[PDB]
RNA sequence: AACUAAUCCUAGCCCUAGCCCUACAAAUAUAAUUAUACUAUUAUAUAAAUCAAAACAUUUAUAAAAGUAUUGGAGA
RNA sequence: UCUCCAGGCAUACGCGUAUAACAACUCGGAUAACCAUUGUUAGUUAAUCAGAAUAGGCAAUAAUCACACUAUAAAUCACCUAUAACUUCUCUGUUAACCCAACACCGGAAUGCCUAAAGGAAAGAUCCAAAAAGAUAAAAGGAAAAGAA
RNA sequence: AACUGU
């Protein structure tokens, strides 16, 4: 879940459970050359790779062997008619084996 | 997780969320609804409506029977505190 | 409120990250001794980065501590420290700490204290020597490096001899 | 100026009766227009080790009024040898045991190409072992001892009886005993405690053991025997031989202690090393005696013999200790017998790289003024009790 | 499953995919609490596939078939949340009377404005939390001049508003 | 140049290393004095009980290295006693050199790539690699071991080839010294060696790998480490003999390696036939490097009281066979 | 009838009148906008001078009675 | 493929998409070609590379291959004793011909490796003006070699 | 002083 507040943990505190997930992910054809078992995903920047591992394993029942994630910087060179820089939204690319 | 001394990460299992996934097998509710399906008149649930639907019948029956007292208000559903529940309405202590 | 760089819990004679913790109260009665004449060994005369004069490591009995070095202080010397105020003057060797009542008139001294229990504040620089101008009963006159001749009680502690770099004033 | 007090620190309304001043406690934050509230101690609801503070020694339940003086590796005795003798109630005989000297007199004991193999090992231990041009004592000093032990251990071919002993890894030796009513404890570690199934042969006869009664422990006024020892008020009474009970080799043959500090100021003096060895060697022997004969205080009918070797990779110290008495409460009586060989130089100097002076190779990559006698003395201790 | 991230193989290459109306709020309210939780994931799964398909379309520089499908799902997903939130809000008010799930209060900043400050949970209390005390919730004396300026600024805005209306009125006469 | 980790968790890691090295890994052991084998068990039983139950040492502060530290101590002791017990039977071991956690280095080029961007766009650049390994223990001798198969031996099993670049799999190129090292300097007389001992960390151990679902890769982790260490180590000796890619070895370089996960023990044999992996030197070479490895096997079952139960001599026999083997 | 150019009417403003006023998420004063401990936490002096006195020094405003008396280097 | 030139590669700092493919040929490059411009899409993958408990007790002796050898310019937490905790791999950085100098500046810019295997092109075309600038050469002479005052 | 296209 993104854009939400998570409970602070103290010693002996309850296990963290997300009953409804706001994370939305997109499977993308590999831009680079990757092994066939490897799968690329565009995921929210606040998601952890463990969350993706749990996300795929639980919601989609997909077995995962390895995960590699990268952050792609969004170009801010573009400017509008007023000469105000336009920033491409940064996205996280996750390589899941 | 928490980073200990020497800047070494130590994952806290409690702080790592566990995705509770509902069982969608046999569930008739789907991404879309037919254009055939007529819309229902919106009746949002409120504290008064929830009290009327759930709490009012119990108190009404007890009041007529005479078995109503201030000590047993929690019996009708009052929670003096939200502590102890996995989901606390206030302060909110659970993720969506 | 500033974090002290002298963060060592215990006084030590080893260089401290180096800086050596100096002691300007010469007569601190060390363990297993009475408040009476006791002797210490000048183990090594090293240089203190945080002080102008070079420090002499004085080790006696069960306690080791750094101190400022006098003109002739060198490694392996034996230095005496006495608190007893004898009826007659106590034998004085260069650099030894005794009450001004013990010291004899005219001896060059250093690391003197203006008031009893104040601690050494004058003649701690290189080449500075205070002359014991006069001595009577429990009173003595010490010429401090500021050129102020001051009279103090005999309880004040004076170390005989000039400070190291004896010819500092003679530098040309 | 001498400052009394750490130099670091240097460069109505409430009393009124009938009403209480208002404070920003309700605000939950400081505001200049409200008085400072009085805050009671905070309760976290759980115990945090990060913010937990160890209680002072006196508050501890294990606190004991009597002070227990504990000696460890870093402890350095002010009097060195003299203090160690008094604490351990031992009598010192200069040189190694007569038996040990005779062990290497046998030609079979001498290793084939012993000097050459030692020379090669020293060169390997200093230069060839690592890719660094000039390895430091922190590295080569542990290695040279291990290589020499292996070279000595290779003699199992000549003497199969050497298979009866094995070397542990930094076992812990500890004992507690009283000297003239002074509570003394020695805590020791490090070494490989070479242990054999049988005790090392007794060096001194019972008549010599009784002769030690004449010997008197030297005293050093005014300094106390407990100087340089860690004064402990929270302690537990323990005797440790370095192994749990049932160990196949209950008898320790040798106790090795190495000083690999590269810098001389970081290196303990040879006298201090032997003093540390004496206390540590004494503790291990005492633990064996207490286990065998219980906690009773008496003259030992069968002395316990243990050895210790201390080296920094260039200087080698050989120590042999025989425990003759367990009645250590008194300062006079039967005394333990210790044989000491000190300042045995394997080599005066070693050049880790070829030394070219005036375009001439004055010094090769090898030990300078190498003394094979030191290894022979080392070999004598290792083979003692087998050959 | 991986296949769930993708559309029906038959639907691939189609101009559009036949889909119905989005879930309305009342129908979701009629559904049970457990059903609502189950539905959200079902709604989400289609959204991810549509989002998954859309990104591939962006990579291929191709249009997304039946883009209204994604909007319908989002409407269904959004309607679910309010219904679930409404039930949570009703129970919270009854048991505690709090109109907000998170503790909060109105506080004055250093600029003299009054803003709702949401309280934060801390492992330590505020009085032993020096940093929290370091945080400023008080207005300086000089802000009184700013407050007067703010009142004057509001009056100026109304005066400018009348000027804006006057110019619009002129053209109304000119146009008509 | 790429920085290669001998022990890695990558899928098909053994295949990846073989492709860069041109090593063929045949499953099983290579084609081929009594010492009271029962006595070794009793001696080894005491050694296991010695460290686990008898030796007294300060507890580690971390509390996580305790399991790893214990495994190292028992393995070292068994090795130490084994050398002494085997010394009377084989005098070669007396002259042999045993290395404790010393590093093996090797540097070689396999594959190529074209720079796609930058000031050097379009220039062809070879893929540079480096393996630095520190085997738990290894035995170095001054005489080459008996060859396990004749030079130029060809088998149907083929070297792997990697679809993706080494970068795609986690492997990062860094500029630093190129090193080829046998575990000791060229000055050291022992320019050959018998066996290598490896201890796998907890992260790569069988229990974690099975939990991670990479149970099949447990052998791959075993295979990758063995192939990396032996090839890197064996190649250095041939370089110490003057042989390089264009001066490929005239005699195959052969040796053994054992990898243990703390409980299971695996035995590996490597023969180095080709020093030519550069395109120029490999342009004309029919030889291939051959590796023979055995699956990991438990050495004992459990430690009860002061008596270890279920010790497996079969693994011990392989160690006995390795220790007794000497050059012909 | 030519290229460069030019053409236009509202964007809004201004002054009085009237009126006072009392109306997403997430992150943040730590280093503001850094999801949880550190480190206690904080604005404001006669209003002056410039200026006038042709400089400059005390000094120099900021309904009728009446700009009168008084005051003032009796001068601005 | 030929002729010729000879500081190259990493990290730090800074920059922030200038990266790459495609499509454009107007504007930007201090002129074009060609793109560094314009538009579109892609990119940089980390358990290993990089960034992000407490209280007491107690420490004399530089380095220089540290040994000898001296010296003056003066140069070294640990470990013990207790208390407390009790099974961990996430987050973030990763592209580029790049930065500070108004610029695709001429200079400014920390460190390691290495000196060509790395990295490059002085020629927009034609003519062979004079004059001017730089370089080389001198019959005989030598201020109209490097020594003295 | 020599030296050299100064």
Per-residue three-class SS string for chain C: CCCCCCCCCCCCCCCECCECCECCCCCCCCCCCCCCCEEEEEEEEEECCCCCCEEEEEEECCEEEEEECECCCCCCEEEEECCCCCCCCCCCCCCCEEECCCCCCCCEEECECCCCCCCCCECCCCCCCEEEEEEECCEEEEECCCCCEEEEECCCEEEECCECCCCCCCCC
Sign of CA dihedral D90, D91, D97, D99: negative
Are C39 and C97 within 8 A, CB to CB? no
Q: Do residues F200 and F73 touch, judged by C-beta distance below 8 A? A: no
User: Given the DSSP bridges, would you call strands D90-94 and D336-345 parallel, antiparallel or unpaired?
Assistant: parallel
The residue among D120, D198, D119, D121 whose CA lies nearest residue D161 is D198
Q: What interhelical angle do F37-49 and F313-324 show, nearest 10?
A: 110
Question: What's the alpha-carbon Rg for chain C, to the nearest Å?
Answer: 16
What is the least distance, in Å, from the CA of E61 to any CA of chain B?
A: 26
Cα–Cα distances in angstroms (integers) from residue E12 to residues A40, E17, E66, E71, in the given order: 20, 9, 12, 20
Map residue D356 onto helix, strand or coil: strand
Beta-carbon neighbour count of residue C111 at 10 Å?
28
Q: Tokens at residue D74, please? A: 């870093």
Single out the residue of A4, E35, A66 nearest to residue A56, CA to CA: A66
How far apart (Å, rounded) are the C-alpha atoms in residues B9 and C113? 56
- 10 Å CB burial of residue A13 (0-12, 13-18, 19+) is middle
- Burial of A53: CB neighbours in 10 Å, binned 0-12, 13-18, 19+: middle
User: Which of E124, E128, E133 shows the shortest C-beta gap to D30?
Assistant: E133
Whole-number Å distance between alpha carbons of F235 and F229: 10
| DSSP state at residue D181 | T
Q: Which two tokens stand for residue C67?
A: 């101190």
Alpha helix (H) residue ranges in A1-97: 49-59
Instruction: Kindly state the tokens that stand for F221.
Output: 């982790």
CB contact at 8 A, C42 and C78? yes
Bin E33: left if φ > 0, else alpha if -120 < ψ < 50, else beta: alpha
Q: Which sign does the torsion angle of CA E33, E35, E39, E42 carry?
A: positive
Cβ neighbours of D139 (radius 10 Å): 17
Tokens 């409430």 found at: D14
Positive or negative torsion for Cα E119, E120, E121, E123: negative
Q: Residue F129 and residue F111: Cα distance in Å, rounded?
A: 10
DSSP code of D55?
P
Q: How far apart are CA A49 and CA A66, in angstroms?
A: 10
DSSP B71: G
After which residues, if any, is chain E broken (C to N > 2.5 Å)?
none
Q: How far is CA D289 from the centre of its chain?
A: 20
SS3 D318: strand
Can you tell me the distance from the alpha carbon of D3 to that of C157, in angstroms, rounded to the nearest whole number?
A: 16
- Chain E residues 96-155 with a CB less than 8 Å from chain B: 96, 98, 100-103, 121
> Coil, helix or strand for F82?
helix
Distance, CA of D219 to CA of D87 (rounded, Å): 10
Bond prior to D222 in cis (omega within 30° of 0): yes
Tokens of D107: 């030609």
Q: Which residues of D touch E127 (CB under 8 A)?
A: 25, 37, 39, 42
Estimate in Å the CA D251 to C1' G42 gap, whole number.
75
Rounded to whole angstroms, the Cα distance separating A6 from A15 reads 12
Interface of B with E in 1-60 (CB under 8 A): 21-24, 27, 29-37, 39-47, 49-51, 55
Distance, in Å, from the CA atom of D125 to the CA atom of D118, rounded to the nearest integer, reads 10
Residues in chain B: 96
Helix E33-60 vs helix E68-96: crossing angle, to nearest 10? 150
Q: How far is CA C75 from the centre of its chain?
A: 16
C-alpha closest to that of C126 among C67, C97, C167: C167
In chain B, beta strands by DSSP E? 2-4, 8-10, 18-19
Residue F308, strand partner residues: F303
The residues near D316 (Cβ < 8 Å, ≥ 6 apart) are: D309, D310, D344, D345, D346, D374, D377, D378
Q: Where are the beta strands (DSSP E) in chain A?
A: 17-18, 26-28, 39-43, 67-72, 91-96
Rounded-to-integer distance, Cα C95 and Cα C74, Å:
11
Cβ-contact D255, D307 below 8 angstroms: yes
Structure tokens belonging to residue D293 = 């004969």
Residues D236, D174: Cα–Cα separation, whole Å: 11
CB count within 10 Å of CB D353 equals 10
Q: What is E91-115 written as a DSSP string?
A: HHHHHH--SSSS-EEEEE-TTS-EE
Who among A20, A27, A59 is closest to E52 (CB)?
Answer: A27
Q: How many residues does chain C have?
A: 172
Query: Quick check: bond before B91 cis, omega within 30?
Result: yes
Residue found under tokens 């090593």: F23
β-pair partners for F293: F27, F268
Q: Give the ranges where D57-157 is alpha helix by DSSP (H).
A: 81-88, 98-105, 114-123, 137-153
Total count of residues recorded for chain A: 97
Q: What are phi and psi of F127, to 5 degrees?
A: -80, 115
Cα(D185)–Cα(D238) distance, integer angstroms: 9
Considering Cα of E38, then E40, then E42, then E48, what sign does the dihedral take?
negative
Residue D189 φ then ψ, to 5°: -145, -160
To which residue do tokens 């032990």 refer?
D149
Tell me, yes or no, if E41 comes closer than 8 A to chain B by beta carbon.
yes
Please name the residue that has the structure tokens 């041009």: D133
D166 touches chain F (CB under 8 A): yes
Asked whether F and B share 3 or more beta-carbon pairs under 8 angstroms, the answer is no
Interface partners of E (3+ CB pairs, < 8 Å)?
A, B, D
Closest CA to F111 of F171, F56, F54: F171
Structure tokens at D32: 């200049």
Contact D349, D369 (CB under 8 A): yes
Instruction: Give the distance from CA E85 to its chain's centroid.
Output: 13
How do F192-199 and F253-260 pair as beta strands? parallel
Say whether the peptide bond before residue F20 is cis (omega within 30 degrees of 0).
no
The pairing of beta strand D182-188 with beta strand D90-94:
unpaired
Dihedral-angle region of residue D82 (phi above 0 means left; psi in -120 to 50 means alpha; beta otherwise):
alpha
Torsion sign across C-alpha atoms C156, C160, C162, C164: negative
CB of F145 within 8 A of CB of F237? Answer: no
List protein-proximal bases of chain G (any atom < 7 A from a CB).
9-21, 24-30, 35-44
The strand pairing partners of B78, in sequence order, are: none
Give Cα F261 distance to the centre of its chain: 13
Resolution limit, Å? 7.3
Q: Residue D78's closest CA among D271, D352, D284, D366?
A: D271
* Bridge partners, E136 (sequence order): none
Residues counted in chain F: 328
Q: Which residue is it, tokens 């055995």?
A: F294
* D371 closest CA partner among D349, D345, D350: D345
Residue D244 forms contact with F (CB below 8 Å) = yes
Q: Is-contact E71 E79, C-beta < 8 A?
A: no
The answer to whether the beta carbons of residues A26 and E52 sit under 8 Å apart is yes
Experimental method: cryo-EM
What residues pair up with D124 in beta bridges, in sequence order? Answer: none
Strands, DSSP E only, in chain F?
23-27, 97-100, 104-114, 124-133, 137-141, 192-199, 253-260, 264-272, 289-293, 297-298, 302-304, 307-309
CA-derived radius of gyration, chain B: 22
* Contact assessment for residue B93 and residue A5, using Cβ atoms and an 8 Å cutoff: no
Strand ranges across the sheet with D194-196: D90-94, D336-345, D315-325, D299-311, D251-258, D194-196, D165-167
Cβ neighbors of D105 (< 8 A, separation 6 or more) are: none
Report the C-alpha gap between B91 and E119 in whole angstroms.
10
- The verdict on A66 touching F (C-beta cutoff 8 Å) is yes
Return the closest-CA partner of residue C68 out of C23, C37, C108: C23
**Angle CA D149–D153–D154, to nearest 5:** 120
Question: F241, exposed or middle or buried, with CB in 10 Å at 0-12, 13-18, 19+?
Answer: middle
Reported as half-sphere exposure (CB side, CA atoms, 13 A), residue F170 has a value of 14
Residue by residue, DSSP assigns F205-223 as SHHHHHHTT-STHHHHHHH
Distance, in Å, from the CA atom of C79 to the CA atom of D310, rounded to the nearest integer, reads: 35
Q: Locate breaks in chain B with C to N over 2.5 A; list the residue preceding each.
A: none
| Overall size of chain E counted in residues | 176
CB distance D342 to D302 below 8 Å: no
Nearest to E107 by CA among E141, E130, E136: E136
Cα separation, D86 vs F106, whole angstroms: 58
Q: Please list, in sequence order, all residues whose beta carbon lies within 8 angstroms of the beta carbon of residue F275, skipping any fewer than 6 positions away.
A: F235, F238, F239, F243, F244, F245, F247, F248, F249, F281
Residue whose CA lies closest to nucleotide H10 C1'? F175
Quote the CA–CA distance of D262 and F83 in Å, as a whole number: 31
Distance, first Cα to last Cα, chain C? 43
Task: Confirm if F92 and F326 have CB atoms less than 8 A apart.
Answer: yes
**What is the rounded distance in angstroms from the CA atom of residue F181 to the CA atom of residue F135?**
13
Inter-residue contact D183 to D236 (CB < 8 Å): no
F222, F224, F230, F233 alpha-carbon torsion, rounded to 10°: -130
Q: Are C18 and D20 in contact (CB under 8 A)?
A: no
**A11 close contact with B: CB closer than 8 A:** no
Burial of E97 (0-12, 13-18, 19+ CB in 10 A): exposed
- For strands F137-141 and F192-199, give the pairing: antiparallel
CA-wise closest residue to C102 among C36, C4, C6? C36
Scan for tokens 């009012």, then name that residue: B56
Cβ(D121)–Cβ(D148) under 8 Å? Answer: yes
CA trace torsion C144, C146, C147, C148 (10° rounding): -70
Which of C32, C19, C35 has the alpha carbon at shortest distance from C60?
C32
Contact between residue F54 and residue F264 where contact means Cβ atoms under 8 Å apart: no
| Neighbouring C-beta atoms of residue E112, cutoff 10 Å | 16
How many whole angstroms separate alpha carbon F302 and alpha carbon F308? 6
Containing D355, the helix (H) or strand (E) segment is strand D355-357
Helix (H, G, I), strand (E, B) or coil at A17: strand
CA D162 – CA D180 distance, rounded (Å): 41
Full DSSP string of F54-70: IB--PPPSSSSHHHHHH
- Listed in sequence order, the DSSP H helices in F130-242 are 206-211, 217-240
Phi, psi (5° rounding) for residue D183? -80, 120
Region of residue F60 (phi > 0: left; psi between -120 and 50: alpha; otherwise: beta): beta
Are β-strands F23-27 and F289-293 bridged in parallel, bridged antiparallel, or unpaired?
A: parallel
- Please name which of C164, C153, C70, C158 lies closest in space to residue C109, comparing C-alpha atoms: C158
Closest approach of chain D CAs to the CA of E100, in angstroms?
A: 19
C-beta neighbour count of F326 within 10 angstroms? 17
């Amino acid at each position: 879940a993104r854009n939400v507040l998570y409970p602070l943990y103290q010693l002996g505190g309850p296990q963290l459970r997300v009953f409804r997930t706001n994370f939305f992910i997109q499977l993308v054809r590999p831009g680079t050359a990757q092994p066939e078992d490897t799968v690329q995903f565009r995921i929210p920047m606040e998601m952890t790779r463990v969350d993706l591992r749990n996300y795929l394993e639980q919601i989609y029942n997909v077995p995962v062997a390895a995960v590699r994630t990268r952050v792609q910087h969004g170009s801010n060179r573009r400017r509008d008619h007023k000469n105000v820089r336009i920033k491409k939204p940064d996205y996280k690319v996750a390589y899941v084996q | 997780g928490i980073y200990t001394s020497d800047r070494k990460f130590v994952q806290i299992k409690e702080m790592v969320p566990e995705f509770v996934v509902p069982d969608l097998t046999g569930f008739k509710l789907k991404p879309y609804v037919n254009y055939r399906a007529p819309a229902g008149i919106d009746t949002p649930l409120t504290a008064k409506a929830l009290f009327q639907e759930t709490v009012a019948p119990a108190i009404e029956k007890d009041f007529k029977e005479g078995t109503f007292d201030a000590n047993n208000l929690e019996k009708y559903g009052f929670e003096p505190t939200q502590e102890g529940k996995l989901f606390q309405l206030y302060p909110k202590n659970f993720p969506r | 409120k500033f974090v002290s760089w002298k963060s060592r819990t215990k006084y030590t004679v080893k260089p401290v990250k180096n800086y050596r913790m100096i002691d300007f109260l010469r007569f601190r009665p060390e363990k297993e001794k009475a408040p009476e004449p006791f002797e210490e060994k000048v183990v090594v005369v090293r240089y203190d980065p945080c002080r102008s004069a070079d420090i002499a490591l004085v080790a006696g009995g069960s306690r080791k501590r750094w101190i400022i070095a006098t003109e002739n202080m060198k490694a392996g010397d034996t230095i005496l420290n006495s608190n007893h105020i004898g009826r007659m003057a106590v034998a004085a060797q260069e650099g030894d700490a005794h009450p001004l009542g013990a010291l004899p008139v005219g001896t060059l001294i250093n690391n003197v204290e203006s008031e009893p229990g104040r601690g050494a504040q004058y003649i701690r620089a290189a080449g500075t020597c205070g002359v014991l101008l006069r001595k009577v009963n429990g009173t003595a006159i010490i010429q401090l490096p500021s050129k102020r001749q001051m009279q103090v009680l005999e309880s004040c502690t004076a170390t005989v001899g000039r400070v190291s770099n004896v010819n500092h004033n003679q530098r040309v | 100026a001498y400052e009394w007090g750490v130099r670091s620190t240097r460069k109505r309304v409430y009393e009124i009766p009938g009403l209480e001043p208002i404070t920003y406690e309700g605000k939950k934050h400081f505001v200049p227009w409200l008085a400072r509230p009085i805050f009671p101690p905070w309760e976290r609801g759980w115990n945090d080790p990060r913010f937990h503070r160890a209680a002072p020694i006196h508050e501890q339940t294990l606190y004991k009024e009597e002070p227990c003086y504990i000696f460890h590796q870093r402890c350095r005795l002010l009097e060195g040898m003299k203090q160690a003798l008094w604490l351990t109630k031992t009598k010192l005989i200069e040189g190694l045991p007569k038996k040990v000297l005779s062990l290497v007199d046998d030609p079979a004991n001498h290793i084939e190409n012993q000097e050459q193999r030692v020379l090669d090992i020293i060169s390997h231990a200093r230069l060839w072992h690592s890719t660094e041009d000039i390895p430091k004592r922190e590295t080569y000093c542990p290695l040279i001892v291990d290589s020499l032990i292996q070279l000595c251990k290779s003699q199992i071919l000549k003497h199969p009886s050497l298979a009866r002993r094995t070397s542990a890894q930094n076992c812990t030796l500890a004992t507690t005993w009283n000297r003239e009513s002074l509570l003394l404890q020695v805590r020791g570690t490090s070494s490989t405690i070479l242990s054999a199934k049988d005790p090392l042969p007794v060096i001194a006869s019972r008549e010599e053991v009784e002769a030690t009664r004449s010997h008197v422990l030297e005293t050093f006024y005014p300094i106390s025997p407990t100087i340089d020892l860690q004064e402990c008020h929270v302690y537990e009474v323990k005797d440790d031989t370095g192994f749990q009970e049932g160990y196949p080799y209950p008898h320790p043959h040798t106790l090795y202690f190495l000083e690999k500090a590269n810098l001389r100021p970081q290196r303990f003096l040879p006298e201090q090393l032997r003093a540390k060895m004496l206390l540590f060697a004494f503790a291990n022997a005492l633990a064996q005696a207490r286990l065998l004969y219980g906690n009773t205080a008496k003259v030992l009918e069968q002395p316990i013999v243990v050895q210790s070797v201390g080296t920094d990779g260039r200087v080698f110290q050989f120590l042999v200790l025989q425990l003759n008495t367990t009645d250590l409460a008194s300062s006079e009586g039967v005394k333990n017998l210790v044989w000491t060989d000190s300042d045995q130089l394997l080599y005066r100097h070693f050049w880790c790289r070829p030394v070219i002076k005036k375009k001439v190779v004055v010094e090769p990559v090898g030990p300078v003024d190498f003394q094979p006698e030191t290894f022979r003395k080392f070999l004598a201790l290792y083979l003692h009790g087998v050959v | 499953g991986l296949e769930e991230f993708f559309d029906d193989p038959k639907n691939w290459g189609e101009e559009k995919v036949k889909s119905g109306a989005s879930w309305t709020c009342q129908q979701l309210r009629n559904k049970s609490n457990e059903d609502l939780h189950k539905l959200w994931y079902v709604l989400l799964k289609e959204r991810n596939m549509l989002l998954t398909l859309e990104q591939e379309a962006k990579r291929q520089r191709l249009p997304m078939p039946s883009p209204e499908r994604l909007e319908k799902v989002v409407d269904s997903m959004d309607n679910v949340d309010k219904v679930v939130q409404e039930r949570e809000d009703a129970l919270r008010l009854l048991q505690t009377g709090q109109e907000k799930p998170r503790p909060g209060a109105w506080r004055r900043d250093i600029f003299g404005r009054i803003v709702w400050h949401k309280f934060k949970q801390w492992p330590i209390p505020w009085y032993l939390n020096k940093r929290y005390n370091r945080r400023r919730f008080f207005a300086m004396p000089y802000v009184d001049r700013f407050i007067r300026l703010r009142i004057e600024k509001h009056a100026r805005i109304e005066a400018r508003k009348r000027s804006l209306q006057k110019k619009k009125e002129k053209i109304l006469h000119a146009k008509f | 140049k790429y920085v290669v980790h001998p022990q890695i968790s990558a899928l098909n890691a053994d295949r990846w290393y073989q492709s860069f090295t041109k090593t063929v890994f045949v499953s099983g052991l290579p084609p081929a004095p009594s010492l009271d084998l029962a006595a070794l068990r009793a001696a080894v039983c005491d050694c296991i009980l010695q460290e686990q139950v008898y030796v007294r040492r300060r507890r580690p502060r971390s509390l996580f290295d305790r399991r790893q530290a214990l495994a190292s101590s028992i393995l070292d002791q068994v090795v130490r006693t084994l050398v002494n017990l085997l010394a009377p039977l084989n005098p070669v071991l007396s002259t042999a050199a045993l290395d404790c956690k010393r590093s093996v280095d090797f540097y070689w080029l396999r594959g190529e790539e074209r720079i796609p961007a930058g000031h050097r766009k379009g220039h062809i650049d070879a893929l540079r690699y480096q393996i630095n390994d520190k085997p738990h223990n290894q035995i170095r001798i001054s005489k080459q071991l008996p060859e396990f198969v004749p030079l130029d031996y060809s088998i149907p099993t083929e070297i792997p080839v990697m679809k993706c670049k080494p970068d795609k799999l986690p492997l990062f190129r860094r500029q630093y010294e190129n090193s080829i090292f046998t575990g000791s300097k060229t000055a050291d007389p022992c320019c050959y060696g018998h066996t290598q001992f490896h201890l796998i960390p907890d992260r790569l151990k069988r229990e974690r790998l099975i939990r991670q679902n990479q149970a099949e890769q447990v052998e791959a982790v075993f295979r990758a480490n063995a192939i990396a260490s032996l090839f890197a180590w064996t190649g250095a000796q041939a370089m110490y003999q003057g042989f390089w890619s264009e001066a490929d070895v005239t005699r195959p370089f052969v040796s053994q390696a054992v990898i243990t996960d703390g409980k299971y023990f695996s035995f590996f044999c490597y023969q180095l036939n080709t020093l030519a992996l550069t395109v120029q030197a490999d342009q004309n070479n029919p030889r291939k490097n051959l590796c023979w490895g055995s699956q990991s096997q438990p050495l004992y079952e459990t430690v009860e009281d002061n008596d270890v139960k279920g010790f497996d001599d079969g693994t011990l026999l392989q160690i006995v066979h390795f220790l007794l083997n000497k050059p012909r």
